[PDB]
Design a protein around this ligand. Sequence first.
Ligand SMILES: [Zn+2]
Ligand SMILES: [Zn+2]
Ligand SMILES: [Zn+2]
Lengths: 296, 102, 186, 187, 72
Amino acid sequence: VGACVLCNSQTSLRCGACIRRPFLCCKCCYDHVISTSHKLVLSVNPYVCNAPGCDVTDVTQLYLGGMSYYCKSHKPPISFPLCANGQVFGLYKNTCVGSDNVTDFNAIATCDWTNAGDYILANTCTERLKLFAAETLKATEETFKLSYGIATVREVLSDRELHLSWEVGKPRPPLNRNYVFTGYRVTKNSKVQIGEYTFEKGAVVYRGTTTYKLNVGDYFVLTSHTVMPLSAPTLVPQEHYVRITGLYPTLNISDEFSSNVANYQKVGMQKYSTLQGPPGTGKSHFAIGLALYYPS
Amino acid sequence: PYPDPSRILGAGCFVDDIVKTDGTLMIERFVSLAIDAYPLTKHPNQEYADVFHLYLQYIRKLHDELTGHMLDMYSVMLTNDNTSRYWEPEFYEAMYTPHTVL
Amino acid sequence: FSSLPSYAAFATAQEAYEQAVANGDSEVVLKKLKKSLNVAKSEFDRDAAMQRKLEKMADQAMTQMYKQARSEDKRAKVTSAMQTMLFTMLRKLDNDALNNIINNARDGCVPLNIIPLTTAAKLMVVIPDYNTYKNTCDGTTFTYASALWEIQQVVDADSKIVQLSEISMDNSPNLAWPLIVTALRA
Amino acid sequence: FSSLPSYAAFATAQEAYEQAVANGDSEVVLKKLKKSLNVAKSEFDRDAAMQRKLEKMADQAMTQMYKQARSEDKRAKVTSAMQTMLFTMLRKLDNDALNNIINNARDGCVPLNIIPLTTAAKLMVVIPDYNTYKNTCDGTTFTYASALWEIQQVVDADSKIVQLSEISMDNSPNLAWPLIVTALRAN
Amino acid sequence: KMSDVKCTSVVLLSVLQQLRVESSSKLWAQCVQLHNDILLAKDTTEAFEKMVSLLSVLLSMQGAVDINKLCE
RNA sequence: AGCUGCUCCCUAGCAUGCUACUACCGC
RNA sequence: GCGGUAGUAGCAUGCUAGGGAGCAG
Ligand SMILES: [Zn+2]
Ligand SMILES: [Zn+2]
Ligand SMILES: [Zn+2]
């Protein structure tokens, strides 16, 4: 129960076949269901045919019968089309405004994040839509990283190298620290706690986080956390105040931040300022001189 | 047979779950309790009939605030209900007269 | 329900019969409009009956699912509503014995046990600062829960007993301030 | 109901009706095309309404037998579970002492309230307060049911381990006090 | 006046119980005992002293942020 | 997490019944 | 002009089934 993605109108409908299951308003949800292959919608109850042993998942084939949603041949004589007026049946019916341009969010929902144009879309669409672009992008590739094989150790040659087998069917991830693995100790009960290592080819050289001795048969996986939708947009709107509000200036300054002080004069007067941070010019010097200028 | 008024009021106030801290979701239990707490309306003691009258007024408030809440979430109301009988004594009087209508 | 297509045909038939009965010409020519008008209320009250029940069907289903949504949103927030309701009732209660300990806990005097009610029995009240000490403990008497207790075993946080006369403002920044001031009721 | 032998015939009858109505030759033509719509209507009366009831009947039967199939699957699952529970709990009881106690019965039928008494390999005491603790489980060893037991793993209401030195007289009011002492059968 | 005491005792025991206070058996026994005395009380003063004795249990804990929930 | 008994509310179905409209059939 | 049957809609009663809630021992 909340607001949809494009319209932000209060709604109760969530696209089942969609990546991250977002809220959608009635007309907005229908616009998604016809402009994508996402043919599943999930309100406070599931929109499926509740007669025993049915498999229909699209909403159009569904019709309301009594206290449920029914398919073509399972309905009673009394029925009603859930998909009518270009707005699917749902809570908060009238308070839906619809979105004129939905194809952007259809593209993001059908996106596989393969080409650069996917990222161009991810940053060109609107505020919560592009936050959702980030949500879906990440969600996709954590669903990706565990679709690779498991690094099951076979032999212990020596220190810093091992022998690695990988499960049949799914490929081997790249051989860098880009894909940080994590291990657990396989026992008679379950798997517990090795730690994060990254593997390269020797023989399989293993770069372990901590010191540790491994044996035969222990395997590591590329773990993912539980990614939960953000609240705020990427950054707050800009506002240039008249003066440094809420802050008390310093009394005297050291030389090594003079070119920095005549800088903090302006980040202090408005809220944000992107810093062209060329490598190694005193960047963390810039950071500490903020506190040197404002200690409290 | 009239019940013990404290029993009726205690059933009104003290409940389980959380569903029942909100009258709108239930209503029907107040209908049943007002059905049970009717015969106090003929009791000479004044502070007994007021229990029944309070129950009637509370049912009325529950109904016409549920209609408002549904009206403000949606934009139309319950096209027809014929629910007035619930907040009038004619409905409850029927259940203590010898003519069964099951 | 008047915006249905069959209503127009019914209206045309009714106008035709009104004209016929206003003229009163034939016996069978108007009888045509009992084989064409008595039908006109057959595809009208058949189409305007089912839609009217469909309206109430939709209304009842919507109300059911709204109630289900409210029921799922209520039983998932109990452990904030209970506390809000409790504190509103407490501030409505208006009893000094309560307000004293509520304010004291709002600034720090949290007891480390159940407050005993007998004339005997022990109490321990954390005191984290000195300004808090000024209001509560005066000399040998401890004022708390609108009662009169007797101060006996002041102690610092490193488990070292600290004497009573030592407690003063200048030497206050010399002690592990989370004092545990054990006492007994009057 | 659109692909039945009757849709064609009703369509032909109505096609003749409309063709000769546009022609509009005779009153007998209207009578014939009315008595044709008034008989070919019976065709769409039963050909498309009694078969409209057979579908309801067939669906009812199909769902009924679906429900019965699920009914007969749940039976197999509960049977497997019950037999597994029986065969896994049996494994703990058959000590040799059970054989020794049953073989000495005059018949082979021994009472039930003496099987755990003379065969159980672990005793569980529950003590409400220290006074009862002193007369039942004092010390590391104690005798119940004419046997000799030795104490280990004393616990309390919160099920936290409590050592034997803690339960004095003065320390007693500081313990959750349905203390549950478990003991082994010494030999 | 006493009815307010009984109702707030019910609410207080509810919040304490959902505050996982029943994992310490002696604590829960004391709380339940005090609740049952308050509910069966016939005069307002002992009700109030048992009330403050009960409230002290919640006050001693550090789960209910007090300066917030007393926003007035 | 028990066994009954009474009462309210909603929906579904079948059957019955009642009433109205249309068609067929002879009389 | 009548009867009967076939239809369709509406209504009532009752019986069964399913769900929700309340009281009494
Ligand atoms: Zn989608
Ligand atoms: Zn929308
Ligand atoms: Zn189906």
